Amino acid sequence: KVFGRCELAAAMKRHGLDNYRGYSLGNWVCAAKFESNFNTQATNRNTDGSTDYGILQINSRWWCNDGRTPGSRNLCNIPCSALLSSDITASVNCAKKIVSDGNGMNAWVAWRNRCKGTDVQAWIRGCRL
């Protein structure tokens, strides 16, 4: 599923991501924009052989099981395929664990490079929330 900007902001808010670990909703929408272009089916293979999955490009090295990332963990206790669902519940629940891990949203290199310190409120401007 390719979400609309305000459609994804509403889904993230409903699942309690708005101001989670102090990150305003526009931070999460900005991260999803540059990670996946709001596409739940987005995948990216990393040089290390891990894979990033879903709207927030969650990586198989730590967070999900894909059966093909040697030495990896599955700290969200999910198959990585769950991160490609039209239902963002698995992505949101796993993102909460990631952002709680110590480095906040710096875990998402695209958030650090393209969202951090920008006017992230523009990502929810005009959304009925």
Ligand code: NA
């Ligand atoms: Na894994």
